[PDB]
Amino acid sequence: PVLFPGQPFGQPPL
Amino acid sequence: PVLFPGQPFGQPPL
Amino acid sequence: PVLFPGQPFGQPPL
Amino acid sequence: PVLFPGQPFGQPPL
Amino acid sequence: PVLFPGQPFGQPP
Amino acid sequence: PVLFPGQPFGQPPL
Amino acid sequence: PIVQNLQGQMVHQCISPRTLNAWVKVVEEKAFSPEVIPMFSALSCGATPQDLNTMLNTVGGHQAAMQMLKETINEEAAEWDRLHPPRGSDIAGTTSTLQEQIGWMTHNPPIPVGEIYKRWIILGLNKIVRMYSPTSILDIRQGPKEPFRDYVDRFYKTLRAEQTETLLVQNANPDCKTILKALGPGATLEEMMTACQG
Amino acid sequence: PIVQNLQGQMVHQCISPRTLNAWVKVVEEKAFSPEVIPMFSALSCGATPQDLNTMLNTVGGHQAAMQMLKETINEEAAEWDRLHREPRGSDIAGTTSTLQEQIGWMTHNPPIPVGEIYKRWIILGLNKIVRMYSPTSILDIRQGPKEPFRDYVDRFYKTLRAEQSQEVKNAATETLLVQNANPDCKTILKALGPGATLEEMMTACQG
Amino acid sequence: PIVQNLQGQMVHQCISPRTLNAWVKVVEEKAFSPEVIPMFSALSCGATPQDLNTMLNTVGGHQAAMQMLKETINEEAAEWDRLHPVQMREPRGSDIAGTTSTLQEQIGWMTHNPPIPVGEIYKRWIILGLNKIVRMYSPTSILDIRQGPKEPFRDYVDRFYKTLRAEQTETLLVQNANPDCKTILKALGPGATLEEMMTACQG
Amino acid sequence: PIVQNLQGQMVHQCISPRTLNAWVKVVEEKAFSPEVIPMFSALSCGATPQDLNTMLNTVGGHQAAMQMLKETINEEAAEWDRLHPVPRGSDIAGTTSTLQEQIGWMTHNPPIPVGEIYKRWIILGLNKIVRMYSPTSILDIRQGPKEPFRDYVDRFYKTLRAEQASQEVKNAATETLLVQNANPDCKTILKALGPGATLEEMMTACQG
Amino acid sequence: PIVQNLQGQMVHQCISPRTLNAWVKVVEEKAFSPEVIPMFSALSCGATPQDLNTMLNTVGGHQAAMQMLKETINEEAAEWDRLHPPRGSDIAGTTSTLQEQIGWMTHNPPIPVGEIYKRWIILGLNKIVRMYSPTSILDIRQGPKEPFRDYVDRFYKTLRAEQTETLLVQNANPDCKTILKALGPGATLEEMMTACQG
Amino acid sequence: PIVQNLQGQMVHQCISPRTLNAWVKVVEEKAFSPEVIPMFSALSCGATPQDLNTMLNTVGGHQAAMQMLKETINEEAAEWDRLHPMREPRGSDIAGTTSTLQEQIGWMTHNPPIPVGEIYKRWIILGLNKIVRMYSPTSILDIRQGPKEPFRDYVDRFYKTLRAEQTETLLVQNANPDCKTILKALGPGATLEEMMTACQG
């Protein structure tokens, strides 16, 4: 998914 | 008159 | 009618 | 004088 | 001095 | 280091 | 709203925080006193139908009034649809987009859908002020030791919410009533209030 | 109101939330003290008749005053009609004129400043209300037994400001201020004589 | 956000302290009442996806709601990717959310001709997620709203349509009124306006 | 006031609600403390005579002071008329001049800054008022038994500012009167430090 | 900061009173809660190193936190010097002038020393948020009469400051836990919260 | 102050009501805490000597500090006149007592410029630092951790004091027995994060 639980909004993954 | 008792300011007549 | 009871102002129909 | 007592500041005479 | 004791800031001599 | 304790952020050295 | 700029062109701007807050706070503080309507009109200056809906939707509570307002908008929208076979729902902002709204407003000749919709909203707000007016003009009478100035304030304040020659003088207390009738008809309010001062 | 821009052209602007609120709050706090009028005038700088009507209409309460204000506007509108698109008295008051027409007259060359003419009527009405709402007459202002002269003079010119003729107010000031002072200060001020400045008078009655 | 200027050109501006504080305070005071959403939409006028994320991140607390909001975004982003598979590159769901796109690309799409309003698309998802949260956090059901013994009709109607707004009329409003008013409302008959109903149950 | 714009031209603007309120509130809160004058000067930056009159007319109360201020303007206007026999004194004060004439004079080349001249008269009158209304004399400022030196010095120079006597008197008051009126504990320490010590050194010495 | 204008050019502006005050107040009120960081990032939009230093210097108190922030800047500044033989001190704004900072930022190609220095600061602030986080995720457990909504709020609030599938349901109270496990795995938080409402 | 416009030119602007109020209020509220100085520098951005004088003159109260500030300005001005015996500005010209607004703008907008506003601000900030030094109530030696005071709160009071007065040995030595024992048991060269984490529980 785009946003994992706990990480901020607009957080770049990896 | 231009303004009657009760009606607001800038109120058109009739 | 344009606006129905409960729904916000400027709510599209259907 | 320019300003008589009681008259607002900048008020014209006559 | 530029400013003597008690004189406003920017006060000329 | 760049910053020392009890000094402002951006204090120039020497 | 749609306003001018440095180049001298009608362009869309976002409704500001100041304007949003000002409208929320006036409704919170004054509820629906007569003066809330002229403040709404001023704060919705150059407003698009979207902006008007935004201002109304930001109101928390008073949903009885907001529901009455919706029913007024419907009546006026239906009347527009009758007279114009931009529909009524487009002026209300339900079936129209911001781009279309700006299109009509900045057209030559323009069709000010913002002003037409505001006219409907103000017409609805006037009914709500009528409803929420606590006292009738007939019930406003000068107290025993009430000054004439305070009485006249209560008279015209009440008259404003409901909406003079005979009713004002006749509902004054004995001491003032004698002086006002002694002054005679066709006297100005200034002359009346100067008379019932001491 | 109508104001200039970057290009240097007289263009209409919407009345700001700051100005609207400022006017509402000054009337709420100060009611109709003399100083409310110059604030009204300043806050309505470059205003159209519509803006003036907006400002007056936003006032909640004080409807006795607002009614007196309507009656003054009627008299001035009637007077204008008697002495005089060409604007009528009702057009200046903003009842029978649109924003388009008001901007037309105000930005015309030569301009007919209907905003300023209508402000003149409103200010003239507000002055009458300040007169009315003034509690004390200048004749009733007298220095107390142990009242400082500074406080007495404050009351005198505050009252005089609300009472408002120039020929009278000068005659009032010259004779009435000294005459209504207490015995001790009165002797000193008469000893100091006519043509003495207020600074000299207040310094003389300090101790 | 992206706005016009003196020259009449769509340019990026930094989000203002007024807009930042306004959004923080409205959440602190109104939590998630129905009227919070139109305030968010207005305060996020012309916003980039970055700006939308900034606004959401500035909210302290309410992390149950923000998590529910994150899950709604994932569903709408997944639906976007399905309907839009694979000048500048065409935006994915994560690009609209502002996780895999830069500010320059966001400005690029929004000011393109024809434009792709990623800010408005992303806002649509957020507002859809906020509506669900307003649904959840609604304390009372419409069935439980009933006029009290000495409660005025005006105050009752306020509570009715306040609860109805958060949940989302003809029969339920009159039926849950108290005996004295109920008799008057039914006596007025069907198809009567709310104004007529409230005027009837005033005294 | 008259200010610059995007094009770089001197044009008239209306006085802002912020400025109007700021001036009303400062007078309400500070009356005629010395610091009111520089606030007036700043808030009236680029002001026309009309704008200066607007600001003064917005002051409710303090009418003794405003009357004293009127008389100062009269004295300065009469002097202007004496030195300039042909803008009259009344034109600078904004009574006999219109806004268009005031903008004319101020934006002329070479300019005649009637706003700045009138402000000079107003500030000269406000200074007289500040002197009048100063409550305490410098001779009456003396350190309390348990009053910190910092607080004592504050009261001394606050009072010295409002009295605003000649520079010779201010220099003389600071040199001898400050130390002489300090309490015994600190006084002993200050005289031990010797003459020509800076205020920083004096205040650091009497901290504990 | 450095921002655009009417002519469409990057130019230096003085940091506003609004921005200054906004940052001082959010620190005074929220201390170092997680949400303080994104507010800092936003208020420092387009900020120069000088502007970033100004914002940090205006913070009264919290000098423990600010010292930890300095030590982080030193570490990142030392690391920059290692990888780049603009120095670390120039990015931090100690050895560089405003003219040089604007020079690098408005260069083509640009070296955004403001954004690099902000990255160090935000990295340091995250460490402070870590430190000042009171509770661990393992200690968050649903109370006896605590609504599930309130429990979930505490869970993810703690999770946010620290930095799910098993720990959230396992630490819930008996009544809700039975319902949540009965719903099964892969259930959305909306479904979980709706299930434990009554 | 002197700032840019649409045309990209340095032009004089009046000091704003917001800036005038902000500076008065920050001095009323924060007196002379360390953080007042950076606020002053930010509020006086691009200021002329005139504008700085206005900001200082709007301060009611704190006249001990303002007098100290005058003496500092004198010392810096006298040093400028010694090192500096287009007409270049004297010390009084930088302080704005003997220079007009025209002349101040003249120096600041010249090519090459002589930034009399920034030089005068330097003297003022230098004087304000001495005042913050003075108005610091506690010495660094007297800051010691209480019996039940958390280590976080102790470190806050330590560096707050240190900031106003202006570390390795004095911070650990003045801590309470329980934390001191742990801090020395972590060893020298440890970061403040590691020290605070150690004395948390």
Side-chain angles (χ1 to χ4, degrees), chain A residues 1-6 8-13, chain B residues 1-13, chain C residues 1-13, chain D residues 1-6 8-13, chain E, chain F residues 1-13, chain G residues 1-5 8-144 146-163 166-198, chain H residues 1-5 8-84 86-145 147-164 168 171-207, chain I residues 1-5 8-149 151-168 171-203, chain J residues 1-5 8-99 101-145 147-167 169-208, chain K residues 1-5 8-81 83-144 146-163 166-198, chain L residues 1-5 8-147 149-165 169-201:
Chain A
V2 179
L3 298 162
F4 293 88
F9 286 90
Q11 174 81 315
Chain B
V2 182
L3 296 172
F4 297 84
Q7 74 174 38
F9 293 97
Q11 182 84 315
Chain C
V2 178
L3 302 170
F4 298 97
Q7 308 284 28
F9 290 92
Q11 171 64 47
Chain D
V2 180
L3 296 164
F4 295 91
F9 286 94
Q11 195 201 51
Chain E
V2 177
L3 301 174
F4 292 93
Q7 91 174 37
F9 292 98
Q11 187 87 315
Chain F
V2 179
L3 305 165
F4 301 90
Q7 295 280 43
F9 290 91
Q11 188 64 37
Chain G
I2 304 183
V3 295
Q4 293 198 244
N5 65 330
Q9 301 176 5
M10 300 299 288
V11 296
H12 181 263
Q13 279 186 347
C14 292
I15 192 168
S16 62
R18 290 201 66 79
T19 297
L20 290 165
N21 188 61
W23 172 238
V24 167
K25 297 291 170 188
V26 70
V27 172
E28 283 176 357
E29 294 163 28
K30 303 291 194 70
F32 287 101
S33 312
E35 74 263 24
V36 173
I37 297 172
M39 184 62 72
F40 174 81
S41 183
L43 290 170
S44 68
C45 177
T48 60
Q50 189 185 52
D51 296 321
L52 290 165
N53 291 327
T54 304
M55 290 172 75
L56 297 174
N57 288 320
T58 48
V59 172
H62 304 282
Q63 296 300 295
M66 300 313 290
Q67 183 57 37
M68 279 196 283
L69 190 54
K70 287 179 184 73
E71 292 182 15
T72 307
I73 290 163
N74 291 340
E75 286 178 14
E76 296 294 311
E79 186 59 28
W80 180 271
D81 291 337
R82 195 181 78 76
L83 298 168
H84 300 90
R87 300 173 187 180
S89 54
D90 293 309
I91 292 164
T94 54
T95 57
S96 68
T97 60
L98 177 57
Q99 198 62 221
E100 289 179 324
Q101 288 167 27
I102 293 160
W104 286 308
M105 291 170 69
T106 60
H107 199 265
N108 192 36
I111 300 173
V113 294
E115 294 296 305
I116 295 161
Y117 187 36
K118 192 194 298 196
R119 197 189 305 115
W120 302 348
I121 292 161
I122 287 169
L123 192 139
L125 289 169
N126 282 312
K127 293 178 181 176
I128 294 157
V129 169
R130 220 107 60 188
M131 281 256 54
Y132 282 39
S133 182
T135 324
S136 173
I137 196 63
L138 301 174
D139 301 327
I140 302 300
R141 300 173 195 178
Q142 188 176 9
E146 190 189 9
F148 188 65
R149 188 200 300 175
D150 295 333
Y151 161 64
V152 177
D153 279 322
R154 294 194 305 103
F155 190 88
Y156 283 100
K157 180 183 172 185
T158 305
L159 187 67
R160 188 186 181 179
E162 295 276 296
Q163 194 77 351
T166 55
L167 189 56
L168 178 60
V169 177
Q170 190 61 19
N171 287 356
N173 67 16
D175 292 16
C176 179
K177 183 185 282 184
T178 307
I179 299 163
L180 294 175
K181 290 191 173 182
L183 190 64
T188 59
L189 185 58
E190 186 175 27
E191 290 165 15
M192 291 175 65
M193 292 177 67
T194 306
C196 294
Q197 195 173 32
Chain H
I2 302 184
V3 290
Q4 292 194 247
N5 64 332
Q9 301 176 2
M10 300 300 290
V11 296
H12 180 267
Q13 280 192 356
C14 287
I15 194 169
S16 64
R18 289 202 64 79
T19 295
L20 289 168
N21 188 69
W23 174 236
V24 167
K25 297 290 173 188
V26 70
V27 174
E28 280 179 1
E29 295 170 28
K30 305 293 195 70
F32 289 104
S33 308
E35 78 267 24
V36 173
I37 295 173
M39 187 61 73
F40 171 77
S41 188
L43 291 171
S44 70
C45 177
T48 61
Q50 187 186 59
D51 297 318
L52 294 165
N53 290 332
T54 306
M55 287 174 71
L56 295 178
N57 282 326
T58 52
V59 176
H62 302 287
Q63 292 304 297
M66 302 312 290
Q67 182 52 38
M68 284 193 281
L69 190 58
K70 286 178 186 70
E71 291 181 359
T72 302
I73 292 161
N74 289 337
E75 289 171 5
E76 298 300 320
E79 173 68 330
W80 179 271
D81 292 342
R82 199 191 47 69
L83 292 172
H84 302 85
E86 321 305 329
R88 300 174 185 180
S90 55
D91 293 315
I92 292 167
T95 60
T96 59
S97 62
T98 61
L99 180 54
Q100 165 55 210
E101 292 175 327
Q102 290 163 21
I103 292 163
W105 289 309
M106 291 169 69
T107 61
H108 197 262
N109 197 41
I112 299 171
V114 294
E116 288 301 317
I117 297 159
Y118 187 37
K119 193 192 301 192
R120 196 188 303 118
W121 303 347
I122 293 162
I123 287 170
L124 194 139
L126 290 168
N127 284 326
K128 292 176 181 177
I129 295 159
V130 168
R131 216 116 53 190
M132 280 254 55
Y133 283 39
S134 183
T136 325
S137 169
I138 194 62
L139 300 173
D140 300 327
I141 302 300
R142 302 173 194 181
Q143 186 179 15
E147 188 189 4
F149 188 68
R150 188 200 302 177
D151 296 346
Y152 164 63
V153 173
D154 272 336
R155 293 197 300 105
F156 186 94
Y157 285 100
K158 181 182 177 187
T159 302
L160 184 66
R161 191 187 178 184
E163 295 277 294
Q164 326 199 340
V168 180
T173 295
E174 287 157 30
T175 55
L176 193 58
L177 177 58
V178 178
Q179 192 64 19
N180 291 356
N182 65 24
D184 292 337
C185 175
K186 186 193 238 175
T187 306
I188 298 163
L189 297 177
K190 285 194 172 182
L192 193 66
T197 57
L198 185 59
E199 188 181 9
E200 291 165 10
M201 292 173 68
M202 292 177 71
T203 303
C205 288
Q206 198 172 32
Chain I
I2 305 186
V3 292
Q4 293 195 242
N5 62 333
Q9 302 176 357
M10 299 300 289
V11 296
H12 180 269
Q13 280 191 352
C14 293
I15 193 167
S16 76
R18 290 201 67 80
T19 297
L20 289 165
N21 190 52
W23 174 236
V24 168
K25 297 292 169 186
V26 71
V27 173
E28 282 175 1
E29 295 166 26
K30 305 296 192 69
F32 286 106
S33 305
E35 80 269 23
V36 173
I37 295 170
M39 186 60 74
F40 172 83
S41 186
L43 292 170
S44 66
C45 174
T48 54
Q50 187 190 67
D51 292 326
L52 290 165
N53 293 323
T54 301
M55 287 175 75
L56 295 173
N57 285 321
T58 53
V59 175
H62 304 282
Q63 298 301 297
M66 301 315 283
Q67 186 54 41
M68 281 194 288
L69 190 56
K70 286 179 186 74
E71 291 178 353
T72 304
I73 291 161
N74 291 335
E75 291 173 17
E76 297 298 317
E79 188 72 356
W80 180 269
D81 296 327
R82 190 184 68 77
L83 298 168
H84 300 90
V86 179
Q87 300 289 173
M88 57 187 70
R89 68 193 187 80
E90 290 161 309
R92 301 178 185 183
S94 62
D95 294 315
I96 293 165
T99 51
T100 61
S101 62
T102 64
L103 179 56
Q104 201 62 233
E105 292 176 318
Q106 289 168 24
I107 291 161
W109 283 309
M110 292 167 68
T111 61
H112 200 264
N113 194 38
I116 299 171
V118 296
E120 297 299 319
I121 295 159
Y122 188 36
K123 193 195 297 192
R124 195 190 302 117
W125 304 347
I126 293 161
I127 290 169
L128 191 138
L130 291 171
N131 284 314
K132 291 177 183 175
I133 294 158
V134 167
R135 220 110 60 186
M136 280 253 54
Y137 284 34
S138 181
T140 326
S141 181
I142 195 63
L143 303 174
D144 301 317
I145 302 300
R146 304 174 202 178
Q147 188 173 16
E151 190 181 3
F153 188 64
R154 188 202 300 178
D155 297 337
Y156 162 68
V157 175
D158 285 315
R159 292 196 302 102
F160 187 87
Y161 286 106
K162 180 177 178 188
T163 307
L164 187 65
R165 186 185 180 181
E167 292 277 291
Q168 198 69 15
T171 58
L172 187 52
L173 178 57
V174 178
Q175 189 62 22
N176 288 2
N178 67 11
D180 292 3
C181 176
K182 180 184 281 183
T183 309
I184 300 162
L185 295 175
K186 289 191 174 182
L188 189 62
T193 56
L194 185 56
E195 188 174 21
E196 291 165 13
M197 291 174 62
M198 290 180 67
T199 305
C201 291
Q202 196 170 31
Chain J
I2 303 184
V3 293
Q4 292 195 243
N5 64 329
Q9 302 178 2
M10 301 301 290
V11 298
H12 182 264
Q13 281 190 350
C14 293
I15 194 169
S16 69
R18 289 200 67 79
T19 301
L20 291 164
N21 190 62
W23 172 238
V24 166
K25 296 291 172 188
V26 70
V27 172
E28 280 183 3
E29 292 163 26
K30 308 294 196 70
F32 288 105
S33 311
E35 79 264 22
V36 173
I37 297 168
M39 186 58 73
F40 173 79
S41 191
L43 289 172
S44 67
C45 178
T48 60
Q50 188 183 58
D51 294 325
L52 290 166
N53 293 321
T54 303
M55 290 169 74
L56 295 172
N57 285 325
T58 53
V59 175
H62 305 283
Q63 294 299 294
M66 301 314 283
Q67 180 55 38
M68 282 192 283
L69 185 59
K70 286 175 180 78
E71 291 179 8
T72 300
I73 291 161
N74 289 336
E75 288 168 24
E76 297 298 321
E79 186 70 2
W80 178 272
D81 288 341
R82 196 178 72 79
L83 299 171
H84 300 81
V86 186
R88 300 151 187 242
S90 56
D91 295 307
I92 292 167
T95 56
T96 57
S97 68
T98 59
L99 177 57
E101 290 177 336
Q102 291 166 31
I103 294 162
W105 273 307
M106 290 167 69
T107 61
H108 197 264
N109 192 32
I112 299 172
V114 294
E116 291 298 307
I117 296 161
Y118 189 32
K119 192 193 295 197
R120 195 191 304 116
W121 302 346
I122 292 163
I123 289 170
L124 194 137
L126 288 173
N127 281 311
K128 290 178 179 178
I129 294 157
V130 168
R131 258 181 303 264
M132 282 277 353
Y133 285 28
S134 179
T136 323
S137 174
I138 196 65
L139 298 177
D140 302 330
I141 302 298
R142 303 173 188 176
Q143 187 174 18
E147 189 191 26
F149 190 60
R150 187 202 301 178
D151 296 355
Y152 161 65
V153 174
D154 278 340
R155 293 194 302 106
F156 189 90
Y157 284 97
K158 179 186 175 179
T159 304
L160 189 66
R161 189 185 183 181
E163 292 283 279
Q164 48 175 304
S166 62
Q167 198 64 71
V169 173
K170 287 189 179 181
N171 295 6
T174 48
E175 284 171 44
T176 59
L177 196 58
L178 177 60
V179 177
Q180 192 63 28
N181 291 353
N183 68 16
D185 292 336
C186 175
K187 184 185 253 179
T188 311
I189 300 162
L190 297 175
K191 289 192 175 181
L193 191 62
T198 57
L199 184 59
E200 184 183 18
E201 290 164 4
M202 291 174 63
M203 288 178 64
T204 302
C206 291
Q207 196 171 29
Chain K
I2 303 187
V3 292
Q4 291 192 242
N5 67 336
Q9 299 153 15
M10 303 302 290
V11 293
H12 180 267
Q13 283 190 344
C14 293
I15 192 169
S16 61
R18 290 207 64 79
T19 301
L20 290 164
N21 192 58
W23 172 240
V24 167
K25 296 290 174 190
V26 71
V27 174
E28 281 176 357
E29 292 173 17
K30 304 295 194 69
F32 287 106
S33 309
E35 74 276 16
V36 173
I37 294 174
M39 183 63 69
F40 174 81
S41 176
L43 293 171
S44 64
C45 176
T48 62
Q50 186 189 60
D51 291 321
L52 292 163
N53 288 329
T54 306
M55 290 172 70
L56 297 173
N57 287 325
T58 53
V59 175
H62 304 280
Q63 296 299 296
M66 301 313 284
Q67 183 55 37
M68 288 192 283
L69 189 58
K70 285 183 185 72
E71 290 179 11
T72 306
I73 289 164
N74 292 335
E75 289 162 14
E76 298 298 319
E79 186 67 356
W80 181 273
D81 294 347
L83 297 171
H84 300 88
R87 299 176 186 179
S89 59
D90 290 316
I91 294 166
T94 57
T95 56
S96 66
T97 59
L98 179 56
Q99 197 82 163
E100 291 170 311
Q101 291 166 22
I102 293 162
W104 283 306
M105 292 166 69
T106 59
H107 198 265
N108 195 40
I111 300 172
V113 295
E115 293 300 318
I116 297 159
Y117 187 38
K118 194 193 295 194
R119 195 192 305 119
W120 303 349
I121 292 161
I122 290 168
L123 194 137
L125 287 173
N126 284 310
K127 292 178 180 176
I128 296 158
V129 170
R130 219 106 60 192
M131 277 234 63
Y132 284 38
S133 182
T135 325
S136 179
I137 194 63
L138 300 173
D139 300 355
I140 302 300
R141 303 177 185 179
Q142 186 173 13
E146 188 191 0
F148 186 63
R149 185 202 304 181
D150 298 353
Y151 163 64
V152 176
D153 275 324
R154 293 196 301 104
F155 188 86
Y156 282 99
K157 180 180 178 187
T158 306
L159 190 66
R160 186 185 182 178
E162 290 273 301
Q163 202 77 353
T166 57
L167 190 55
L168 178 59
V169 180
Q170 190 62 28
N171 292 0
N173 69 21
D175 291 358
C176 179
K177 181 188 281 181
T178 308
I179 298 162
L180 294 175
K181 289 191 175 181
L183 191 62
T188 57
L189 187 60
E190 185 175 14
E191 289 168 3
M192 291 173 63
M193 289 177 67
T194 304
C196 292
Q197 197 171 32
Chain L
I2 302 183
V3 292
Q4 291 195 250
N5 64 336
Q9 303 176 358
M10 301 302 288
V11 296
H12 181 266
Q13 278 190 345
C14 287
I15 196 165
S16 75
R18 291 198 64 78
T19 304
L20 290 169
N21 188 53
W23 171 238
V24 167
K25 297 291 168 188
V26 71
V27 173
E28 281 175 9
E29 295 166 27
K30 305 295 190 69
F32 287 109
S33 310
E35 74 265 28
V36 173
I37 294 173
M39 186 60 72
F40 172 81
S41 188
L43 289 170
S44 65
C45 176
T48 62
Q50 188 186 62
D51 296 326
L52 293 162
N53 290 326
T54 298
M55 289 173 70
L56 296 175
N57 285 320
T58 52
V59 175
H62 305 282
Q63 296 300 293
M66 302 315 290
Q67 181 55 40
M68 273 194 282
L69 191 55
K70 289 174 184 75
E71 291 180 24
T72 303
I73 289 163
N74 290 335
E75 289 171 23
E76 299 302 323
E79 188 64 15
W80 180 275
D81 290 356
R82 198 181 65 80
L83 300 172
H84 301 85
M86 198 200 189
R87 191 226 301 172
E88 296 188 52
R90 299 177 187 180
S92 58
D93 292 317
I94 293 167
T97 59
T98 56
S99 61
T100 59
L101 179 59
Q102 293 175 349
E103 291 172 328
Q104 290 164 28
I105 292 160
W107 281 305
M108 293 168 70
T109 59
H110 198 261
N111 189 34
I114 300 172
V116 295
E118 293 298 312
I119 296 159
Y120 188 37
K121 191 191 297 195
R122 193 188 304 126
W123 304 349
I124 292 162
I125 289 171
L126 196 138
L128 289 169
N129 280 312
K130 293 176 181 177
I131 294 157
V132 168
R133 217 110 59 188
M134 275 239 56
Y135 281 39
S136 186
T138 322
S139 178
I140 195 63
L141 300 174
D142 298 4
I143 303 300
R144 306 174 190 180
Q145 188 175 10
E149 191 187 17
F151 189 66
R152 187 201 300 180
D153 297 322
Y154 164 61
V155 177
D156 280 344
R157 294 193 305 99
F158 187 86
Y159 285 98
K160 180 181 177 189
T161 305
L162 186 63
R163 185 184 182 180
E165 294 283 302
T169 55
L170 190 57
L171 177 56
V172 179
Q173 189 60 27
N174 289 356
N176 64 15
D178 293 4
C179 179
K180 177 188 283 182
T181 306
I182 299 160
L183 294 175
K184 292 190 174 182
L186 189 62
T191 58
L192 185 59
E193 185 181 32
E194 292 165 10
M195 292 171 64
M196 291 175 70
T197 303
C199 289
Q200 198 174 38

